[PDB]
Design a protein around this ligand. Structure first.
Ligand SMILES: O=[N+]([O-])c1ccc(O[C@@H]2O[C@H](CO)[C@@H](O[C@@H]3O[C@H](CO)[C@@H](O)[C@H](O)[C@H]3O)[C@H](O)[C@H]2F)c([N+](=O)[O-])c1
Length: 300
């Protein structure tokens, strides 16, 4: 009864709060690309995550390029499937317009406006939905002030015409690490959060201090993607540094989604090769990363 209990989420003094104004922290999993590992996104696997891991949020990672939505728009129906399951399971859900190689969110802004118009029209009267309008803006030529903020200022109005106050997570520069620039030039909408993403393979002490700087400007931060691996999503599992970030996020009441729910042979993948796509995973079907993430959510 997560959604029944906390209901409408909003931002108050830079903090995510429930409909009674109490601080709330969401912890869950992100899918991998829906064009590749969509079979792991379904009511049964999400229910298993809710019941056995304790998740209270699920992130649907709809890549735009890399064979995603722009090339084959059918993947938007898998996002709808995930939203409907979240509604049925009474958990929160993030709709992620998962830009990456298409590094400037303006490249597909017309399609983004059409997609968010459709999703907000369909689901704008449910409290479960969180819109993430540009996963990871990246590149030296893509800045908050010149590219990202103006993009958000075109897409947010589209959403707001159908859904006036569900949370919107807006990506930041340098693969959603540059929360410092965003916090110094914040968007006007009162229910916006800025995305901050990390990988435990990178020594993170300055990045933690940067998140703190942003929080100190009154900006709300959602860690909508993080991994136990290196920044490529592979290269080793770094559980000591991941624990430091877990403790940091708890102290700052930061919500998060781990990357990712797939059996792909890479360190950040939570599942091993024989894991059933509909859940019920034994200890051996979880990777070293999945075992750790499951423990962190169960402990919460
Ligand atoms: O340098 N960084 O800080 C940084 C941070 C984040 C990041 O990218 C992000 O974080 C992971 C790990 O890099 C990416 O997932 C990886 O996407 C690859 C390309 O689709 C897949 O082949 C790989 O299986 C998958 O795990 C997510 O799409 C992307 F949001 C990347 N990146 O993709 O290069 C770089």
């Amino acid at each position: 009864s997560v959604v029944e209990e906390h209901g409408q989420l909003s931002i108050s003094n830079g903090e995510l709060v429930n409909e009674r104004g109490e601080q709330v922290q969401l912890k869950g999993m992100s899918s991998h690309g829906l064009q590749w590992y969509g079979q792991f996104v379904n009511y049964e696997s999400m229910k298993w995550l809710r019941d056995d891991w304790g998740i209270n949020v699920f992130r649907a990672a709809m890549y735009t390029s890399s064979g995603g939505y722009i090339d084959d728009p059918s993947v938007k129906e898998k996002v709808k499937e995930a939203v409907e399951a979240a509604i049925d399971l009474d958990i929160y859900v993030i709709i992620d317009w998962h830009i990456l190689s298409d590094n400037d969110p303006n490249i597909y802004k017309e399609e983004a406006k059409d997609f968010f118009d459709e999703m907000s029209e369909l689901y704008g009267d449910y409290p479960n939905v969180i819109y993430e309008i540009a996963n990871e803006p990246n590149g030296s030529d893509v800045t908050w002030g010149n590219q990202i903020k103006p993009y958000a200022e075109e897409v947010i109005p589209i959403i707001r015409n159908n859904d006036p106050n569900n949370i919107i997570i807006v990506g930041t520069g340098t693969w959603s690490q540059d929360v410092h620039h965003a916090a110094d030039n914040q968007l006007a909408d009162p229910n916006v959060m800025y995305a901050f993403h990390f990988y435990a393979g990178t020594h993170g002490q300055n990045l933690r201090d940067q998140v703190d700087y942003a929080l100190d400007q009154g900006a709300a931060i959602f860690v909508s993607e993080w991994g136990t691996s290196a920044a490529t999503g592979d290269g080793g599992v770094f559980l000591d540094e991941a624990q430091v970030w877990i403790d940091f996020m708890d102290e700052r009441n930061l919500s998060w989604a781990n990357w990712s729910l797939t059996h792909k042979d890479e360190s950040s993948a939570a599942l091993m090769p024989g894991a059933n796509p509909t859940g019920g995973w034994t200890e051996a079907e979880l990777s070293p990363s999945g075992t750790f993430v499951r423990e962190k959510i169960r402990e919460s």
